[PDB]
Every structure is written in structure tokens, then in C-alpha cells.
Amino acid sequence: VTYEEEAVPAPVRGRLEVLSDLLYVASPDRAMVFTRTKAETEEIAQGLLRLGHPAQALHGDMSQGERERVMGAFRQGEVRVLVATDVAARGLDIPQVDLVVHYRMPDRAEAYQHRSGRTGGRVVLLYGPRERRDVEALERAVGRRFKRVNPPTPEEVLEAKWRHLLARLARVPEKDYRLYQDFAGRLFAEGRVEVVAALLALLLGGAPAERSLLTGEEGWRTYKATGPRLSLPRLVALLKGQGLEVGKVAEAEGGFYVDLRPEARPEVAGLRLEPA
Amino acid sequence: VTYEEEAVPAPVRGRLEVLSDLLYVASPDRAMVFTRTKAETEEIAQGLLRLGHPAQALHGDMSQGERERVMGAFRQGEVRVLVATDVAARGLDIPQVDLVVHYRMPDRAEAYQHRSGRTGGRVVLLYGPRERRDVEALERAVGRRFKRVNPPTPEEVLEAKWRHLLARLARVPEKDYRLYQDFAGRLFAEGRVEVVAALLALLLGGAPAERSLLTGEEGWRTYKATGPRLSLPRLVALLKGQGLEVGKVAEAEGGFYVDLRPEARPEVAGLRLEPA
Ligand SMILES: [Br-]
Ligand SMILES: [Br-]
Ligand SMILES: [Br-]
Ligand SMILES: [Br-]
């Protein structure tokens, strides 16, 4: 084996978004994103374009003619990301890529090998809804231990957008951009830095939701909580005593995980609270 | 009649682009763009999105279900432009609009009235390939004299993009844009005004082609040429004497029209040369 495998934890809700973070943060020249069903490919493919990613889908209602253009654009560099099923994937007409992402893990360890094999390069599995056992079953089937890796921090992501956004800027002919050298001039003059920020948002897709890492649900910030003889009821009574809103509490390694609101600020005596 | 009608000259090549110029320059809250065939609507609709315009098509392979969403998005303000045929247009389920554009003039003066009637508001006919007689036939059928109007200058257009682009900026929450207040800060600091211009190009679609106003062809700048006893052969011999490349020459009102190259600079003694 000559590729690195990674299991990235991602709830079944923020997944699409985790996918996008990873694409920006790795800057693969070519990616392939394997899902389960035909329906999901267009679903996912649409939302990556939506998220600034050059992506197109691939399912089985593809006629030979409208499958080849796809592949042409993909290899050349026009579409940097391809979203497919295990079926529309096979064929000697399929490029080599930098990254494979298992959006929905392989329904068997033969479909993992044919999926990942297409890459040395990099392979990433998305799991969240506590698919953890399904993951280590794959590892048993496959006989490999996928290194667990953290998804990119929001900060990591932004420097990535920016970085991509810059390289993209350096691609604009002087004729194109000189056309706007007046308006850009107007801005710098009047020091309209807020306006420029707005511009960036328009391109980089602005504010992400604060999502829980236990439920993929928004309006939550997942935490790590450890404390003396701290069991759920206690941890919970301590938080409710501070008049907080408590969501998904689950048991962690050396403590509990506990969603609190994105805004709430947690200082409970004796109890040690960090985000995850 | 309670709407203003205009005939805008536009070659059969730069037409799509003339369409876009007009949309930006008028800033209609809702537009409807009538074409001839079903195929053209998606053709045109696609290229307006491509050109920064919120547009969607409407043809006849529309099933009741996937026709209504369309109309919902249109009236509400989601899609600001609708591209249709004379058939998929009829129905009591069709909004009132600010602008109607006859991309391809009405094949009869009943279809002009049902087209335009849907607007007081504004009606615009596109003609170019010397459809001028077809135009004044319509006027005879309809019994009205459409005021001839110039298409917007490239400069007119740009202030329009910009203007739209600004109002669009004022719509971004402080949370979205503050997310980028660092990067925007980096720019102003280092005075990277070229970079900002690039950003604008990315959004505003950069350099337009220099197109001939006689052939809709690019690599030409159409002119107006008048001179003493100036006939074609002479006008042409004068230009070729100055070692120029001459394209479509046609006869104008009080002179000739003559494409020359976008770069060429024309000073021929006695002959009076302006662009159109
Ligand atoms: Br990679
Ligand atoms: Br409890
Ligand atoms: Br208007
Ligand atoms: Br001649």
C-alpha cells in the first residue's frame, strides 16, 4: 500500500461542510468523492459548487456521451472535484487522483479497496453518528488501522479560502483588472475597508454555523468536561445551577462531552471546560 | 397604450451581451426576455447567470410542478429575469414586470402585443442583421413607431455593474464581513490596489470583446466616415494607403460605416473619422 488513510470524525449533518473544509485545506489538484446512492452525488456535487468548488456528479443515468465531457473537464483541470457512486466509478476511463473521500463508508471492504486504490496519494473516511465500530470493522476487513485525524479548524479553513482566492487573483490579465483600477482606487482613497471585507464574504461564502460535534446540529458548541467524581447528573446540575442551556451530553474519555450555546461562557468552580 | 417601446440596434452576435448591458443599466426589478424557440431560452438563460444575472428559462417541457417554483422565485425577487417562449408565456399565472425584451422579434403582431402587454413599464426590441425593415413592418402591423435607442456604452455598463455590486455589498451582515476584516486589512495596509482590482474583475466579469457594430464580429471597431466625393472605393483606397486592415464597409447616412482594428488609429487627411 502506497497511500495514507485517515478517518476524520464528522457528524452526519455538518458533513457536506466538513467535506468542503478539507478540499480547501488540502488543495488537491484532483479529488474523487464516493457516496452510496445515485441521488446523493448530484445532491453533494451541487453543494460544493455552492461552496466555491469546481465539482460535478456521476451516477449511472450517464450516457456514454455525457460522461466523457465530464472526464475531459476533470483531468484537464476544469472540474477539480468528482462525486460518484461505486458503479459509475468502474471503467478504464477513470483518471488517477490526489484525494479520495468516503462520504458514506463502503458497504463492503472490496468497495473500499476499489474506491481508495484510485489514488502516493490520500484517502479519507467520513464517520460521525458513532459509526466508530463500523469504521474499526472496515479496518478489520481491510486489516488496516486508519489514523484518526481532526477536521480542519474554521481558522485553518479561512486561511485556505484566502490562499486559494489569492492564487486565483494572480490569474487575471492586467486588461481585465485594469478595467476596475478606478473603482478599486475609489475604495483605497476613502479607506472603505468594511466594503472590501463585504467583497471577500461574497466570494468566500461568509459565516459558518456553530454546529455541535455530537449531533451535527447548529446552535451548539460541543465541549470537553472533566471533574472530581463528575457523573452526568452532577456535571448537568452544575451547569443548570449556572442557569445554562444544556444539550446533547454524552460520555467522553476522561470526562463528558456537553453541548452549550455558542454564546454562553462557562466558568463552574472546580470543573474544567474546554471546547473540542 | 401605457408603456414605452424602444428598438435597440444590436448585431446577431453581440446580442446576448447587449441584453446583459441593458439589464445592468436599467436595473429592472423583474424582466421577461422573449425568444423564438424552446432551445434558445436555456441557451440565453444560462449565459445571463454566466454574466452575473439571476435568470431562469421557460419553454414547454415544463411540467406544472417545475414551473411554479420558477414563478415563485421570480415574483419574490430570487430570480430577477425570466427567459421564455410565446407558448410557455401564456397563462393567468404570470406576474407583471418592469421590462420586456424581444430577443428575436415577434413572428406576428399578435405575439408582440401579448408579449409587450405584460408590462407603465418598458418594452425593447433587439434588431441588428439589418432586420430594420422587419422592424418597421411591425410598426405598421402594430401601427406604432418604436423610438430607436442606442445600446449602453461600455462605460455606462461598468458604472452599472459597480452600482449593483455596491447595493449588494450593503446587504452583507457585519458577522459575515467582519470574518474577513483581517484579510481586507492586510490589503489596505500593503496598498495592494491591483489585487483589489482583480477581485472586482472576478465578480464583474472582466474584459468585453471589441465587436463590430455591423457584423457582431470581434476584432473590429465600427466607424463613421464622411468625406468629399467619398465613395466606397475611395474611402477604401485612402485607408489601404495608410496600410490599415479594412473589414465590413457598408453605406451610412451621410457617409460609410467601416470596421477597423480595435488598436488602429485613423488619421487620413480630409476624411472625418469617429467611432459609432
Ligand atoms: Br491531498
Ligand atoms: Br442527567
Ligand atoms: Br426598466
Ligand atoms: Br471597394
TrEMBL record, chains A, B:
> Would I find Transcription regulation among this entry's keywords?
no
Gene Ontology CC terms: cytosol
> One MF term from GO for this chain?
metal ion binding
Q: What's in the keyword line of the UniProt record? A: ATP-binding, Helicase, Hydrolase, Metal-binding, Nucleotide-binding, Zinc
| Ranges of residues in domain Helicase C-terminal | 18-158
Provide the binding site for Zn(2+) 2. E217
Q: Which residues are listed for Zn(2+) 1 binding in this entry?
A: E210
Q: According to the lineage, what is the superkingdom?
A: Bacteria
**Record: residues binding Zn(2+) 3:** E253
Q: Which family does it belong to?
A: Belongs to the DEAD box helicase family.
Protein name, as recorded: Heat resistant RNA dependent ATPase
Q: In terms of the whole protein, what range is present?
A: 218 to 498 of 517
